[PDB]
């Protein structure tokens, strides 16, 4: 029926018909990045004595 | 995210008592909000469709009141089966959102 | 005379995935928009998604809006949760649930499922 909807017929002769496309969706989502050098020291301003 | 908060979350009455929970929400939900009761254990029953319209199968003990942003669960008797956590729920903007949920307890 | 049985619970490593399943069989389905909610072990029903009745829009929630997917099976009646890259505020009781809406999904009956045990450890 898809090559039908297609050749917007109802009688489809002998042949390949292209009707579609295929593509393949994704599934994950990574978001990668690098670890963490200095880091600033809030130690030293929230916590002096 | 519309946010709702539930008061009193902590509450012990005893039997014949009357009990009133107070949902709170953030924006303006018109008269959507569902009361589910879970007893420990279990999956929770609802009580209350559309914060008025009392269901089949639950007693004519509970009761649901209030619109536009306050909501108000009435319970007008505590036999010993009332004892669970009741829950809110919005429907106007996705998602839906329950409450914290509130605990009756015994004396 | 309704069933919900749910399945898909176990021990999992952080950042791992899991299919949860939702096999109903009493009610028509696939005439209701059915829903995962999850409760934490000693705290209150959050929610995670929501699927319509043909599968078209899904909706999620705020804070898991990416890692899981919800999809449904209407030739074999089931719900699906595909949950990846897990963290450990995820260890769970997950219901099966169809929510007495009428606004979106338009139900009438309020139906629970079980709830299946999801640890992350
Ligand atoms: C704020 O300062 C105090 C003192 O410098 C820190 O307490 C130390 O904490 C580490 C690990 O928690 C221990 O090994 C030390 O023995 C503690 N020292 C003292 C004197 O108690 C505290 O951790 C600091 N806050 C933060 C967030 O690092």
């Known amino acids: 029926s898809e090559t039908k909807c297609t050749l917007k017929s109802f009688t489809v002769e002998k042949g390949i018909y292209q009707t579609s496309n295929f593509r393949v969706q994704p599934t994950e989502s990574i978001v990668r990045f690098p670890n963490i050098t200095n880091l600033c020291p809030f130690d030293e301003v929230f916590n002096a004595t | 995210v519309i946010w709702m908060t539930q008061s009193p979350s902590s509450l012990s009455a005893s039997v014949g008592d009357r009990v009133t929970i107070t949902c709170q929400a953030s924006?303006?939900?018109?008269?959507?909000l569902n009361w589910y009761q879970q007893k420990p254990g279990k999956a929770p029953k609802l009580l209350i469709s559309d914060a008025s319209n009392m269901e089949t199968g639950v007693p004519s003990r509970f009761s649901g009141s209030g619109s536009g942003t306050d909501f108000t669960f009435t319970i007008s008797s505590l036999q010993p089966e009332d004892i669970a956590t009741y829950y809110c729920?919005?429907?106007?903007?996705?998602?839906?959102?329950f409450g914290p949920g509130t605990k009756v307890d015994f004396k | 005379e309704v069933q919900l049985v749910e399945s898909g619970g176990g021990v999992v490593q952080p950042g791992g995935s899991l299919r949860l399943s939702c096999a109903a069989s009493g009610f028509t389905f696939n005439s209701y928009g059915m829903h995962w909610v999850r409760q934490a072990p000693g705290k209150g029903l959050e929610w995670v998604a929501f699927?319509?009745?043909?599968?078209?829009?899904?909706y999620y929630a705020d804070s898991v809006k990416g890692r899981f997917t919800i999809s449904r099976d209407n030739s074999k009646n089931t719900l699906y949760l595909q949950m990846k890259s897990l963290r450990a505020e995820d260890t769970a009781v997950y219901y099966c649930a169809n929510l007495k809406d009428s606004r979106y999904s338009g139900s009438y009956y309020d139906y629970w499922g079980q709830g299946t045990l999801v640890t992350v450890s």
């Open positions: 729920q919005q429907y106007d903007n996705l998602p839906f959102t």
């Open positions: 924006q303006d939900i018109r008269f959507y």
């Open positions: 699927i319509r009745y043909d599968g078209g829009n899904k």
